[PDB]
Amino acid sequence: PEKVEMYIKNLQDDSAVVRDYAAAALGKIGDERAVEPLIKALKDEDEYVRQSAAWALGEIGDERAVEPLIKALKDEDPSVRLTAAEALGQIGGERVRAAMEKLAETGTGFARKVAVNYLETH
């Protein structure tokens, strides 16, 4: 309802507690209008907010999140990395496998490990 719009607006709140709650809520609701706002929240200053946005994007399953989530594999925060890796798995499908294939080739570190292990499990 107007809850979805409230939570999308709350992603711009000064409080990280409020932004985090909103990101998670939008993931549960599953509405598509939240995808672009959540992609922006992947760059939040707060690591919990980024983790919630990553999870929420995987939960929605909209493939607009695939390349932003791949970038999140480089996040300094390990909760964000694991959650993003998990989110890519949740979205799944050929486009993700396509990206992992590329990533396994021209990637490094964790992101490469994620790609390599994704390809081995598909």
Binding site: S15, V17, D46, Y48, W55, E76, D77, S79, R81, L82
Partner: protein, 273 residues
Amino acid sequence: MMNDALTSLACSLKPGTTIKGKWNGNTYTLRKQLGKGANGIVYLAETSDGHVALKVSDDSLSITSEVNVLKSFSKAQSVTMGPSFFDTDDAYIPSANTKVSFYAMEYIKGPLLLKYVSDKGAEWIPVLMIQLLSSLSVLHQQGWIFGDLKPDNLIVTGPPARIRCIDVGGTTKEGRAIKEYTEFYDRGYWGYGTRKAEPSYDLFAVAMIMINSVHKKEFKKTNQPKEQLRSLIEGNPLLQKYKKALFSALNGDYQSADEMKKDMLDAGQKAAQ
């Protein structure tokens, strides 16, 4: 159930029992007991607005202390592991013939830390320890030391994965003496220092929690505890990876949780490249 008061309270309070706050007038209907200890009894309780976890004690001082700990968490600029605080009040329990004090907090459920990492994988262990360290930094900056920090008191909610503490009993003001502790997680037991409430006490416990999370059991010290712990850490692929943080926490190298967090982040970064 430790003193006569609390044990009599425990026998007194039944599902269906209602407790009404003296000062604020909120009514809590007990549904089931969640937990029992020296610091009080915890119930799932129903209100007109839903459900809460309700902690009840004859000791108003410890109830007030715990309330202020939860309030300290709630002042953080970010999320923390602590449950939200809702209410605190006194009440008279006619059956137990005693005045009691209580507080209501967020009811949270989820697998214990050890169950979570067993199910989702060991890679989550340092991740959840970093969340734990972030929350301890909040507490420490407010002058509180967790003290009896142990895995049975930590659950993981989500998704997304969040470590949470389910009881703050025994949190202690910095500078005072920690009196509530568990041997395996206790600096003093292992011969590595005092039970002074200071950040480094909590950091020792974090190291032991990570060791328990990997090893999946507790064990007694031997005659050579330092070599015992060194051997266990170095012999395990995951603990070895984080040995700088773990050894520094055991040895008292750190003054703040942020320093341990930094070393854990760095060890993770190296692998993540």
